[PDB]
Amino acid sequence: SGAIYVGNYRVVNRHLATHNDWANLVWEDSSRDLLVSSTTAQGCDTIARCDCQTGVYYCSSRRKHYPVSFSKPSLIFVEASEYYPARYQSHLMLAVGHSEPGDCGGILRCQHGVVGIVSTGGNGLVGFADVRDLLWLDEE
Ligand SMILES: CN(C)S(=O)(=O)c1cccnc1
Ligand SMILES: [Zn+2]
Numbered sequence: 001s002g003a004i005y006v007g008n009y010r011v012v013n014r015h016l017a018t019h020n021d022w023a024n025l026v027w028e029d030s031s032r033d034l035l036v037s038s039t040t041a042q043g044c045d046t047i048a049r050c051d052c053q054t055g056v057y058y059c060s061s062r063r064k065h066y067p068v069s070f071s072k073p074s075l076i077f078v079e080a081s082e083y084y085p086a087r088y089q090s091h092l093m094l095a096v097g098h099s100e101p102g103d104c105g106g107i108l109r110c111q112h113g114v115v116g117i118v119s120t121g122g123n124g125l126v127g128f129a130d131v132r133d134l135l136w137l138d139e140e
Contacts, residue, residue: 002058002105004114005043006137011036013104013119013129015083031090033104033119033129036137048112048132055110057118057126061100068095070108070115073130078120091130092120099126 004011014035021037028035056065070093080086082101099121106118108128120127
């Protein structure tokens with residue numbers, strides 16, 4: 001589990017969004033596994049605006065943050081998980097590392113701020129849903 005709190009926005013994995021999230025919906029995209037809902041209190045996170053390919057991610061199934069190199073966001077085939085069938089996911093970055101389903105929502109961060117959240121795992125990789133293209137998160 002986990003979310004990004006930027007401005008008056010909450011960014012979660014679409015597959016983990018709550019009824020309150022859907023009732024306060026700003027934007028969602030199944031192909032990206034992302035949903036954004038509105039918040040009453042302002043958040044503590046800053047979104048990265050960059051093309052970094054190195055950063056650090058939180059792995060809840062290890063209680064650890066790991067430094068990783070990761071691919072640029074792309075359209076990637078993802079094998080079946082407990083929460084999605086085998087499918088193509090867009091805006092997905094991959095790194096070598098540990099990811100189980102409950103790790104979804106862990107933050108990946110670079111020197112510029114939050115890059116994205118854990119969205120995929122298995123076969124010794126961790127996949128992250130990028131948010132650095134979502135410039136509207138920074139205003140309004
Ligand atoms: C490069 N990829 C194909 S992607 O999925 O990250 C992407 C990026 C921008 C717009 N639409 C899709
Ligand atoms: Zn960066």
